[PDB]
Amino acid sequence: TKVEHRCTTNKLSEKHEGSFIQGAEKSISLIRGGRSEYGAA
Amino acid sequence: SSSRKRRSSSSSSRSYTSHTNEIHKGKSYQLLVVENTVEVAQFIN
Fold this sequence. Notes:
The structure is cut from a larger assembly and holds chains A and B. Chain A is low in regular secondary structure. Chain A has 1 helix and 1 strand; from the N terminus they run βα. By secondary structure, chain B is an all-beta fold. The termini of chain B are far apart. Chains A and B meet through strand 1 and helix 1 of A and strand 1 of B. Chain B: Residues 3-21 are annotated as: Disordered. Chain B: Belongs to the complement C6/C7/C8/C9 family.
């Protein structure tokens, strides 16, 4: 008597994670009149 | 794999296995201020 049993198996996996943020601000201001202590403020 | 003949026999197994990861981060922040003060505005010579 002769017997033979055989197998092959394969597996794969992946994962990904991502983030981004962006900000921009501008200010423009003109003061005319004041004491420059509070014209500054 | 496993094999038997008659008595004699042999058997085997395997795992190739592998993994990879990466990360990155980048950040930049840029500021400008320009300011003028005056206390006399035409000074005229």
